[PDB]
Amino acid sequence: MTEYKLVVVGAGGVGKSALTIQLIQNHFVDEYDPTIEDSYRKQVVIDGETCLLDILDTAGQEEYSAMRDQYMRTGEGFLCVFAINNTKSFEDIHHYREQIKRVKDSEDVPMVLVGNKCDLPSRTVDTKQAQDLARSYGIPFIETSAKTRQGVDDAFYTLVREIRKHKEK
Ligand SMILES: Nc1nc2c(ncn2[C@@H]2O[C@H](COP(=O)(O)OP(=O)(O)O)[C@@H](O)[C@H]2O)c(=O)[nH]1
Ligand SMILES: NC(=O)[C@H](NNC(=O)c1c[nH]c2ccccc12)c1ccccc1
Predict the structure, then answer these.
(1) Of 145, 88, 92, residue with least CA distance to 114
(2) Residue 56 maps to which CATH number?
């Protein structure tokens, strides 16, 4: 049983916790503490491989930067989820990608761009914009919704494969 350590990083309010809890508790949480940083584990036999997923629902700000940067190094795959109805979170993608790349000191870092809230209206971030960015980074992008669980299943699976892809280069 192989263990995969992945961290869901992004802006606050994008739905980091809900997206993960949906695949852990099998239901959508309407109200959940945004400052909670818990780690959930899930075992799935994906691609004929029985692996154990180690995920961490980031809050946003830790007591010390070194503590936040700690799991930034141990993270093999990072799920970059943003809100299509919040352009502010989409622009922050540049900072995260650049920052985490520096922390690990690598240009080839397994990441998947995720556009949450695809089931909600008032979309300011067009799909093309997100896709354009993902194609420039050299990573995949899929729209998702924690409420309908659309794309979320694929996104999480893709991240694991991206990790494997990086470890089989
Ligand atoms: N309608 C809708 N709300 C979502 C979605 N994902 C998360 N939310 C809501 O966003 C708010 C914060 O969710 P939370 O799990 O704390 O995400 P986080 O704080 O960004 O890690 C809550 O009201 C969630 O129910 C979604 O996909 N669709
Ligand atoms: N945030 C935490 O619980 C940190 N430990 N856990 C982790 O790093 C991991 C938990 N889930 C992960 C997913 C991918 C990589 C790492 C982890 C932590 C932070 C500060 C001090 C001591 C421990």
Answers:
(1) 145
(2) 3.40.50.300
